[PDB]
Enzyme design. Structure first.
Site, PDB file in Angstrom:
ATOM      1  N   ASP A 430      -5.042   0.641   3.659  1.00 38.33           N
ATOM      2  CA  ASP A 430      -4.010   0.663   4.767  1.00 38.33           C
ATOM      3  C   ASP A 430      -3.227   1.970   4.607  1.00 38.33           C
ATOM      4  O   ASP A 430      -2.989   2.397   3.495  1.00 38.33           O
ATOM      5  CB  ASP A 430      -3.055  -0.606   4.641  1.00 38.33           C
ATOM      6  CG  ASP A 430      -1.749  -0.540   5.503  1.00 38.33           C
ATOM      7  OD1 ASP A 430      -1.766  -0.509   6.771  1.00 38.33           O
ATOM      8  OD2 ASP A 430      -0.652  -0.527   4.907  1.00 38.33           O
ATOM      9  N   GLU A 483      -7.779   3.122   7.123  1.00 33.29           N
ATOM     10  CA  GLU A 483      -6.910   3.280   8.334  1.00 33.29           C
ATOM     11  C   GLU A 483      -6.039   4.473   8.121  1.00 33.29           C
ATOM     12  O   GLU A 483      -5.255   4.537   7.162  1.00 33.29           O
ATOM     13  CB  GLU A 483      -6.002   2.092   8.549  1.00 33.29           C
ATOM     14  CG  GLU A 483      -5.046   2.295   9.676  1.00 33.29           C
ATOM     15  CD  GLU A 483      -3.681   2.824   9.219  1.00 33.29           C
ATOM     16  OE1 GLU A 483      -3.105   2.102   8.366  1.00 33.29           O
ATOM     17  OE2 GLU A 483      -3.245   3.936   9.674  1.00 33.29           O
TER      18      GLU A 483
END
Ligand SMILES: [Mg+2]
Ligand SMILES: [Mg+2]
Ligand SMILES: [Mg+2]
Length: 755
Positions: A430, A483
């Protein structure tokens, strides 16, 4: 080696097999050394020594007996290798079981750690059951170079550490062996810093932890608690390219999928434990254990047809409400759901059902909690000392000093650790931007540039590249997913070509285009056709994963149904159209729990999902829809073989903005696997809508999102349509289709059909 020495090993007469098995130095040359590696592999016909970090592989030869193997290798050092072992038609890859003769740290261990290259440091740091001076016990070791003193405190000494003060080695690492204690031992480190101040820390390399909000580490005999059965799954993964396979991921937060009753014990694999209450606010509810999740989540996912389960962070973390993204126990799976062996069972059981496991992994930061890594030894040890690169002020957390060898080693080895000990099939990281940029969420005058005057966090980039380099060498065949939200280039490209080394990247632009698009009233989508099409312009610069994640159904964004305009019928139809388009559009797929059955409410991590909705037909039909779509996805090569090649996709026509219609082809190796996809993003049906197709023949209506079993109006082409010889959209043949409202059709030429 001699036949007498070999026979001693074969017939279990040798006094110490470590003398002979494993890696031994034969001689030193000017620039290099000659080693032998020896293994006894009963039932294997063949074996190789893999040196994955040098990209080499050497065969082993049988010597005096067919299951005794030797491999002589010349190289300056032989720290990093694996054994490949062939039994019959099957191969496995493993670490050498005779790699480490003793539980204590060697000079070599310490030297490698000092350089940040000890890929297996967690075999020696932390707490391990073993034998020293002929006595069984536990060896503890911890990195704390500026401590004035350290002692082991625990159940075994009533938290008094005066007689278990540790010994410092090489000015850097403290150790102690404690006889006659074993697994289950509860413990912490008591540290005195340079100012004389005394405090307590959980074990950074701890393998198990008490249940939050308690923080003592627990000793685990991590190689003797579970028996795996997933050799065939691992062989298949190592020998395949997941980029060329279907990948549909069900994203899951283990703590909030399903709860159980806190009025009973939490069952575990062959045992049980006290319930872990989800909260004081909801005290009748408890978490399910890893064991119960294996029994309930896994068949649920299998029946849904997803290929992978992606877990929100399961490393040990102190606050439920971080969702797992603030970790303090990087080397232990959270005790919320039971024990290490319970999660091993969970992974083993996914693999048996043909399901991969992807872990959200969080190397970007850690929180300030005093039991954890912060200011560990009375200095900025794990975090960088300068807060302009060592704190994320807006988040209230600390940033690892990626440039410091032992810190890099902690994280690099941690990633390998989950693949080694827990057999996981991928990771997802993330907010990679948070690592990559020295000015991340920092105002002017509050950060400093790198040595070349740029904003690139050089040390972090280098760390990310090493993580991905090592992962794929040691475990080919895995998923490494990023991401990254600032258009950094080459996120999902090889490190040798200047990339960061991930093999997939979340397509956040695509997510935003789609959810903004479906959120617009249908009459107005005509002003926004570019949302449907734009992401194919940059699509081939990365390998994209199309994710609709947990982040998109919290904090007032609504769950999927609530994002959609219109009446109830239309809201569901919009969800089916959006997800049929997602599954046909190039890229891999990720969707989050509750999306598959139309939960109305936002994901709320303080409860579990609203399972009662599945008593009602609409929710059931939508779930059947996803079950069918997943099955289709696995059955149709054109939906997955060429996601990342130009061949795999071509627009047929995408200019009819006035009716919000688009159409395209997907292709695979066989031209007969080609698919024609046609999308109608308004509630207006069309009885005659012509679409160009590349070949004469009958086009089977393979899938229709308006089918009645999905809750649709059941409009469509009654099985399929014969192409007309009638040039259209620059193609020699064409179909005159019926297009259902707010719906997507997938058609396929059946070349064996009777005219
Ligand atoms: Mg005391
Ligand atoms: Mg726009
Ligand atoms: Mg509930």
């Amino acid at each position: 080696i001699s036949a007498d020495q070999v026979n001693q090993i074969i017939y279990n007469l040798h006094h110490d097999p470590f003398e002979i098995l494993g890696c031994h130095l034969l001689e030193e040359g000017k620039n290099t050394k000659k080693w032998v590696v020896r293994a006894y592999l009963p039932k294997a016909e063949a074996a190789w020594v893999i040196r994955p970090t040098e990209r080499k592989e050497d065969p082993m030869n049988s010597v005096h007996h067919p299951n005794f193997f030797e491999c002589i290798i010349e190289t300056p050092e032989l720290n990093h290798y694996q054994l490949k072992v062939k039994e019959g038609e099957h191969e496995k890859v493993i670490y050498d079981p005779y790699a480490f003769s003793s539980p204590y740290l060697t000079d070599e261990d310490i030297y490698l750690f000092s350089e940040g290259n000890h890929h297996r440091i967690y075999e020696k740091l932390g707490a391990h059951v073993g034998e020293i001076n002929g006595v069984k016990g536990v060896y503890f070791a911890v990195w704390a170079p500026n401590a004035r003193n350290v002692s082991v405190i625990g159940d075994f000494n009533n938290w008094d550490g005066r007689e278990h003060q540790m010994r410092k080695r090489n000015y850097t690492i403290w150790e102690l062996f404690v006889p006659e204690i074993g697994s289950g031992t509860v413990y912490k480190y008591e540290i005195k810093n340079s100012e004389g101040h005394i405090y307590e820390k959980s074990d950074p390399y701890g393998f198990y932890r008490e249940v939050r909000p308690n923080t003592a580490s627990i000793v685990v005999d991590i190689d003797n608690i579970y028996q795996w059965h997933d050799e065939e799954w691992l062989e298949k993964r190592r020998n395949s390219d997941p980029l060329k396979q279907p990948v549909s991921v069900y994203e899951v937060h283990l703590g909030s999928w399903l709860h159980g009753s806190s009025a009973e014990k939490m069952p575990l694999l062959n045992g049980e434990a006290d319930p872990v209450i989800v909260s004081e606010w909801n005290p009748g509810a408890r978490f399910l254990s890893y064991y119960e999740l294996a029994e309930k989540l896994i068949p649920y996912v299998k029946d849904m047809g997803y290929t992978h389960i992606e877990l929100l962070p399961i490393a040990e973390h102190p606050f439920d409400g971080s969702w797992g993204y603030q970790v303090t126990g990087f080397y232990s799976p959270t005790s919320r759901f039971g024990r290490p062996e319970d999660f091993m069972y969970f992974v083993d059981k996914c693999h048996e059902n043909g399901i991969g496991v992807i872990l959200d992994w969080v190397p970007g930061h850690f929180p300030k909690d005093s039991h954890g890594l912060a200011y560990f030894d009375g200095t900025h040890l794990y975090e960088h000392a300068d807060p302009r690169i060592g704190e994320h002020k807006e988040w209230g957390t600390l940033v690892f000093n990626y440039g410091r060898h032992e810190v890099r080693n902690f994280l690099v080895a941690n990633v390998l650790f989950w693949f080694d000990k827990y057999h996981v099939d991928g990771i997802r990281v993330d907010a990679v931007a948070s690592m990559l940029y020295r000015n991340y969420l920092r105002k002017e005058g509050e950060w400093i540039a790198n040595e070349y005057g740029g904003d690139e966090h050089i040390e972090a980039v280098s760390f990310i590249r090493e993580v991905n380099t090592l992962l794929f060498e040691y475990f080919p065949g895995i998923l490494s997913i990023a991401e990254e939200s600032t258009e950094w280039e080459k996120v999902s490209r090889p490190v040798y070509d200047g990339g960061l080394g991930f093999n997939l990247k979340w397509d956040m632009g695509w997510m935003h285009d789609m959810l903004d698009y479906f959120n617009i009233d249908p009459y107005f989508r005509q002003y926004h056709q570019n949302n449907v099409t734009f992401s194919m312009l940059y699509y081939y610069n990365e390998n994209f994963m199309l994710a609709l994640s947990h982040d998109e159904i919290v904090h007032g964004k609504s769950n999927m149904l609530g994002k959609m305009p219109g009446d109830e019928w239309q809201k569901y139809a919009n969800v089916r159209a959006l997800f049929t388009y997602m599954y046909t559009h190039p890229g891999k797929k990720t969707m989050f729990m509750s999306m598959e059955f139309g939960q109305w409410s936002e994901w709320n991590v303080a409860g579990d999902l609203e399972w009662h909705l599945l008593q009602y037909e609409p929710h059931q039909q939508l779930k059947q829809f996803f079950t069918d779509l997943n099955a289709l996805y696995q059955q149709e090569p054109a939906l997955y073989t060429h996601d990342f090649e130009y061949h795999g996709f071509e627009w047929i026509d995408c200019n009819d903005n006035t009716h919000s219609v688009v159409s395209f082809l997907r292709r695979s190796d066989d031209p007969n696997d080609s698919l024609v996809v046609v999308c109608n993003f308004t509630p207006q049906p069309h009885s005659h809508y012509r679409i160009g197709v590349p070949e004469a023949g009958y086009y089977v209506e393979l899938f229709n999102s308006d089918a009645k079993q999905y809750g649709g109006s059941n409009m469509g082409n009654l099985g399929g349509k014969w192409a007309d010889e009638w040039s259209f959209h620059n193609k020699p043949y064409s179909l005159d289709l019926c297009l259902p409202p707010l719906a997507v059709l997938i058609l396929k030429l059946d070349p064996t059909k009777v005219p």
